[PDB]
Amino acid sequence: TLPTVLITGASSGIGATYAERFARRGHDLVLVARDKVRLDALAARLRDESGVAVEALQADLTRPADLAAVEIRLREDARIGILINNAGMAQSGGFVQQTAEGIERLITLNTTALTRLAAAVAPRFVQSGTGAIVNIGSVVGFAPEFGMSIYGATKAFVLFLSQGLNLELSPSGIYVQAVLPAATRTEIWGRAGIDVNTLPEVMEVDELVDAALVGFDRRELVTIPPLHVAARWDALDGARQGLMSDIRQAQAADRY
Amino acid sequence: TLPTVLITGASSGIGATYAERFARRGHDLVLVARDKVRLDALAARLRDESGVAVEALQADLTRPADLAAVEIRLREDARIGILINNAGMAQSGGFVQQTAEGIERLITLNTTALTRLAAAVAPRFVQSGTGAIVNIGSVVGFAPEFGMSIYGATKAFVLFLSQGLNLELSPSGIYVQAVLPAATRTEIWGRAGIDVNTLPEVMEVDELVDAALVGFDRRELVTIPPLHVAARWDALDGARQGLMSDIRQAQAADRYR
Ligand SMILES: NC(=O)c1ccc[n+]([C@@H]2O[C@H](COP(=O)([O-])OP(=O)(O)OC[C@H]3O[C@@H](n4cnc5c(N)ncnc54)[C@H](OP(=O)(O)O)[C@@H]3O)[C@@H](O)[C@H]2O)c1
Ligand SMILES: NC(=O)c1ccc[n+]([C@@H]2O[C@H](COP(=O)([O-])OP(=O)(O)OC[C@H]3O[C@@H](n4cnc5c(N)ncnc54)[C@H](OP(=O)(O)O)[C@@H]3O)[C@@H](O)[C@H]2O)c1
Known part of the structure; x- marks a missing residue:
């Protein structure tokens, strides 16, 4: 029997396509987002088209009580063996046009909620010796130049957490994947007050998710579909380790 | 007249040494942390020894009302021209031994509060055409192997935010520094349930801060005192840009069909 997949941000975009795709592979699903009505239509479609069980679970992951209720479900339900930590939003406007409320929301959703859901399944996954955590990062995490x-x-x-979780948890049989899209045609752009049609280039959501799932099936750790030269990843990671090899912690460097 | 410095996590460790050092350079100070009694003693010492004004400002930066009160003070007080976003804690135990409450606290302090205080001064700094934001990151941000x-x-x-803020704000005259210590002899270790004496090597807090301040005076963007070969930073940043140069966003790469 295939593991049930809990997907956050399942109501649209990358989340919704993951849901469609996993339903077509034969997995039961738990779909979470705020828009219950939209989730109930999507769930019904997938139950009908694919014959799997699909539960629509309303939750605002920036509301403490909702997040806690999703944590509970992840801790307690042994059927759930794959977590897609996909729920996320982009930044609206530059740094000076930010608000305290907006900063709180962006960080809580993209970081605190993601990390907490992963922490809700990890103990159970360790005990069972199996499980998968797919975290959705972004190419923008390599690009301070992009302006967000x-x-x-x-x-x-999210990239760093994913790397760290891999080292901590793969020895207990857990797969931890970081998936890093670049611009992809979802509701994120309009949510942030950007017209997606003004971006030079944008990937279709079907093509991104299928690429991501090729990575998933190969059990790839860091999956970057729009990176046309794979060895740039290895070179980034090498330079990181290279830097680490020249840390001498007892004394400040001569130049200081 | 020299700018007032607001320092978070001023009651001990790196924050407290920054406070001592900036007081000796002649800056007035605003010191923030939870331990009011300890802040009042430190403030009194620095007022007496150095003859600058020093205010002790109690705040738990993980409590919404306290954080909002520090934001207000940063927005409204034109005297404050340097922000040291130093308050922070480490992780206690591995990932499976974490708690919802502990995760909330660690992320809120190290990330949300830091970002919000920086956002509280940036508009005023942009308007004045001057200001400095010093964010304390860590070498551990290069090291998933370290286990935290x-x-x-x-x-x-914190590193990424710092890089981004530099590009957004230096065109308006703002200095944004990322300071990245490695193991340094402060209260962080005991807070996390680690005996600092079991670490192979540990830098004295005086030496770290003085190194950081050499970086600060040279207006260095990324300052990593324990990195004995500077060019490893440039090579990491190059590889990052190298990766960015081979992103083609319309189509998935051949290896994913
Ligand atoms: N260009 C891209 O699309 C791109 C590129 C790289 C990475 N990403 C990442 O991809 C992930 C998916 O976003 P997307 O591109 O698929 O955008 P999307 O169409 O906006 O989907 C975002 C999903 O997250 C849910 N969500 C938003 N706020 C929420 C909250 N407070 N609580 C619970 N759920 C919430 C949304 O449903 P409700 O609004 O109904 O809650 C929606 O299902 C994000 O993590 C994003 O950072 C996107
Ligand atoms: N090895 C190292 O020490 C090392 C290496 C790299 C980076 N860092 C970074 O250096 C920074 C300073 O830490 P440290 O090494 O100096 O440790 P520290 O001696 O524990 O100092 C931490 C300071 O932050 C304050 N703080 C803790 N929780 C707080 C809260 N909720 N609200 C407001 N303030 C709070 C503390 O005072 P109260 O507890 O009285 O609130 C204290 O003044 C941190 O950001 C840390 O991540 C340290």
Whole structure:
């Protein structure tokens, strides 16, 4: 029997296409987002088209009580063996046009909620010796130049967390994937007050998810569909380790 | 007249040494942390020894009302021209031993509060055409191997935010520095349930801060005192840009069909 997949941000975009795709592979699903009505239509379609069980679970992951209720479900339901931590939003406007409320929301959703859901399944996954956590990062986490300083910071967070979780949890049989899209045709752009049609280039959501799932089936750790030269990843990671090899912690460097 | 410095996490460790050092340079100070009694003693010492004004400002930066009150003070007080976003904590235990409450606290302090205080001064700094934001990251943000997956993530956040803020704000005359210590002899270790004496090597807090301040005086963007070969930073940043140069966004790469 195939594991049930809990997907956050399942109501649209990358989340919704993951849901469609996993339903077509034969997995039962738990779909979470705020828009209950839209989730109930999507769930019904997938139950009908694919014959799997699909539950629509309303939750605002920036509301403490909703998040806690999703944590509970992840801790307690042994059927759930794949977590897609996909729910996320971009930044609207530059740094000075940010608000305290907006910063709170962006960080809580993209970072705190994602990390907490992963922490809700990890103990159970360790005990069973199996499980999968797919975290959606972004190419923007490599690009302070893109101009979304906070959002990009949240996505650097998600990449790093994913790397760290792999090292901690793969020895207990857990797969931890970071998936890093670049511009993809979803509701994120309009949510942030950007017209998606003004971006030079944008990937279709079907093509991104199928690429991501090729990565998933190969059990790839870091999956970057729009990166046309794979070895740039290895070179980035090498330079990171290279830097780490020349840390001497007892004394400040001569130049200081 | 020299700008007043607001320092978070001023009651001990790196924050407290920054406070001592900036007081000796002649700056007035606003010191923030939870331990009011300890802040009042430090403030009194610095007023007496150095003859600058020093205000002790109690705040738990994980409590919404306290954080909002510090934001207000940063927005409204034109004297404050340097922000040291130093308050932070490490992770206690591995990922499976984490708690919802502990995750909330660690991320809120190291990330949300830091970002919000920076956002509280930036508009005023942009308007005045001057100002400085010093964010304390960590070498651990380069090291998923170190085993603190959440804490390290918060420090990858702080580095990235710093880089982004530099590009957004230096054109308006703002200096944004990321300071990245490695193991340094402060209260962070005991807070996390680690005996600092079991670490192979640990830098004295005086030496770290003085190194950081050499960086600050040279207006260096990314300052990593324990990195003995500077060019490893440039090579990391190059590889990052190298990767960015080979992103083609319309189509998935051949290896994914
Ligand atoms: N260009 C791209 O699309 C792109 C590129 C790289 C990475 N990403 C990442 O991809 C992920 C998916 O976003 P998308 O592109 O698929 O955008 P999307 O169409 O806006 O989907 C976002 C999903 O997250 C849910 N969500 C938003 N706020 C929420 C909240 N407070 N609580 C619970 N759920 C919430 C949304 O449903 P409700 O609004 O009904 O809650 C929606 O299903 C994000 O993490 C994003 O950072 C996107
Ligand atoms: N090895 C290292 O020490 C090392 C290496 C790299 C980076 N860092 C970074 O250096 C920074 C300073 O830490 P440290 O090494 O100096 O440790 P520290 O001695 O524990 O100092 C932490 C300071 O932040 C304050 N703080 C803690 N929780 C707080 C809260 N909720 N609200 C407001 N303030 C709070 C503390 O005072 P109260 O508890 O009285 O509130 C204290 O003044 C951190 O951002 C840390 O991540 C440290």
